[PDB]
Amino acid sequence: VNMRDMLKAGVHFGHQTRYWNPKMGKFIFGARNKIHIINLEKTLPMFNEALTFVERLAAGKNKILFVGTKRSAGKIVREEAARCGMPYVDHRWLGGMLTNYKTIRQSIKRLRDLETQSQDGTFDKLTKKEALMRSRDLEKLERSLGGIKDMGGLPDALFVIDVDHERIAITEANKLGIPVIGVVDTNSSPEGVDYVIPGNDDAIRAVQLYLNSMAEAVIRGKQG
RNA sequence: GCUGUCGUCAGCUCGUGUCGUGAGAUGUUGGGUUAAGUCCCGUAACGAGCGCAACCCUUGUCCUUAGUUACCAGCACCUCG
Ligand SMILES: [Mg+2]
Ligand SMILES: [Mg+2]
Ligand SMILES: [Mg+2]
Ligand SMILES: [Mg+2]
Ligand SMILES: [Mg+2]
């Protein structure tokens, strides 16, 4: 908002200049002291475009999936996708979560009924020898499948925090053919992302800026 | 039908997904660890089956029930078994 919250924290920064993607050359305002700088005055209209798109998609009972698996960004998306509904992923993305949803449906069922088992009133009233194993399986399943426990159907649109690190999700999203929102850094590619956000990554303040923007956008959208 | 052998070695495969024009490949590679494809972590793979392990028999400790044809600590007799 108003070119100052983003200009303050970390948004006007890039990944040096040695590792830059030619297709970002149109978004570079300059390279001060060997580091690329993003043209924020161009980011604002498309940032607001993404905000208004997700806001108008909120009304209509559509589900928006968030992807944030990264160092120091998983917990932010975990807590921030909390409330306002919507699923998320907070740890390693599983290959085939979209193109092979039938298989992961079984894992979802296993997670649900094992959660019921371990929280039925302490069903495991027996030796801890295999109860520890059961709890370990529970936490292992949670750590990768907690965010998508709901949403029996495929998401109508998807949100990304970084496109280089999780290219696989975007690839299979285009293969399924659904809209995608992505934060494209200076060493990334606009290929496969529909609504581009030429923002910044690896800076925390920027990432909660992005995710709060999205979350209160969907809040003001789904009110009806 | 039954049996030997590699070999009681730890391997051999499938569904769905993905990569390749295809034969095919990933799963099943990698860092550790284990008797073991055993387990953990990572990881375009996610799961499953036959194997490994476990359930069977026996051996080593104790407890309950049992005391004849088995036993003899105590009591007595004893021809001293
Ligand atoms: Mg093909
Ligand atoms: Mg193979
Ligand atoms: Mg093999
Ligand atoms: Mg096994
Ligand atoms: Mg065996």
CA A62 – CA A154 distance, rounded (Å): 10
Instruction: Answer whether any strand B atom is within 7 A of the Cβ of A116.
Output: no
CA A57 – CA A158 distance, rounded (Å): 11
Residue given tokens 């659904």 in the structure block: A178
CA A115 – CA A85 distance, rounded (Å): 20
Answer yes or no: are the C-beta atoms of A154 and A178 closer than 8 Å: yes
Write the DSSP assignment of chain A as a string of letters: -TTTHHHHTT-S--STTTS--GGGGGGEEEEETTEEEE-HHHHHHHHHHHHHHHHHHHTTT--EEEE--STTTHHHHHHHHSSS---EE-SPPPTTTTTTHHHHHHHHHHHHHHHHHHTSS----S-HHHHHHHHHHHHHHHHHHSTTSS--SPPSEEEES-TTTTHHHHHHHHHHT--EEEE--TTS--TT-SEEE----S-HHHHHHHHHHHHHHHHHHHT-
**In this structure, which amino acid lies at residue A84?**
C
Answer yes or no: are the C-beta atoms of A89 and A148 closer than 8 Å: yes
List the determination method: cryo-EM
Quote the ligand 2 centre to A94 CA distance (angstroms): 21
Over the Cα atoms of chain A, what is R_g?
Answer: 19
Query: Using CB atoms within 10 A of its CB, is residue A120 exposed (0-12), middle (13-18) or buried (19+)?
Result: exposed
Edge-to-edge, what's the strand order for the sheet holding A195-197?
A88-89, A64-67, A157-160, A180-183, A195-197
CA A61 – CA A54 distance, rounded (Å): 12
For chain A residues 128-157, those near strand B by a CB cutoff of 7 A are 136, 140-141
Note the CA–C1' distance, A138 to B76, in angstroms: 74
Resolution (A): 2.7
Nucleotide nearest to A102 (CA to C1'): B16
Count of other CB atoms within 10 angstroms of residue A222: 19
CA A147 – CA A125 distance, rounded (Å): 29
CA A175 – CA A178 distance, rounded (Å): 8
